[PDB]
A paper describes a structure:
Fra a proteins are members of the pathogenesis-related 10 family and are required for the normal accumulation of flavonoids and the development of color in strawberry fruits. PR-10 proteins belong to the START superfamily. These proteins adopt a helix-grip fold with an internal cavity capable of binding hydrophobic ligands. The data presented here demonstrates that Fra a proteins bind natural flavonoids, providing for the first time mechanistic insight on the function of these proteins in the control of flavonoid biosynthesis.
The [name] protein crystallized in two different crystal forms. The two crystal forms belong to the same space group (P212121) but show different unit cell dimensions and molecular arrangement. Crystal form A contains two protein molecules per asymmetric unit, whereas crystal from B contains six independent copies per asymmetric unit. The refined model contained two molecules of [name] in the asymmetric unit. Both molecules showed a similar structure and comprise amino acids 2 to 160. The region corresponding to the β3-β4 loop (amino acids 61–63 and 61–65 in chains A and B, respectively) was disordered and could not be modeled. The three amino acids from the N-terminal purification tag that remain after TEV cleavage were also visible in the structure. As can be appreciated in Fig. 3a, the structure of [name] conforms to the START fold and consists of a seven-stranded β-sheet, two short helical segments between strands 5 and 7, and a long α-helix at the C terminus. The β-sheet adopts a slightly curved shape with the long C-terminal α-helix (α3) juxtaposed against the concave side, which creates a cavity in the middle of the protein. The open end of the cavity was surrounded by loops α2-β2, β3-β4, β5-β6, and β7-α3, designated here, respectively, as L3 (amino acids 35–39), L5 (amino acids 60–65), L7 (amino acids 89–96), and L9 (amino acids 125–130), and by the N-terminal half of the last α-helix (α3). A number of well ordered water molecules were found inside the cavity.
Author numbering: -1 to 60, 65 to 160
Write the structure that this text describes.
Amino acid sequence: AMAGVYTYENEFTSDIPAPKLFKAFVLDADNLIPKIAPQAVKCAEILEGDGGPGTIKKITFGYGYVKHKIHSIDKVNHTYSYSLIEGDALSENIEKIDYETKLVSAPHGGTIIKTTSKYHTKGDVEIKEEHVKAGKEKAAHLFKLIEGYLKDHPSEYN
């Protein structure tokens, strides 16, 4: 019954400018990711809301699905936050996970992507280093694919 929050932060870099990355990775993820990784995302459907705060999305992938609830989108600052509210990473021990991502402009025109994950826990906390790392290496593979797409279609997301 003990409720708590485990917070984990991570950061990676890109040569892609922040605005373009924001438009592609963040704002057009429903459309872009199916294109470059049909297994990571087959389908995204909005179940309620506009597409801004409060929006609920169902994401189906090549098998199972998750639901995301959008908390905020700050287009001007290039920050985004949303929670995993249904899916297999959840349990009686992890009731939900909040993500917050910030795209910061690097010195030479690229980006530093900073992500905070907050696991809302119940009872004893058990969180394996190996599952956290497997999550980062999966995301990084898919991020590298997005970067490749943006470099292969330079007239997009300007």
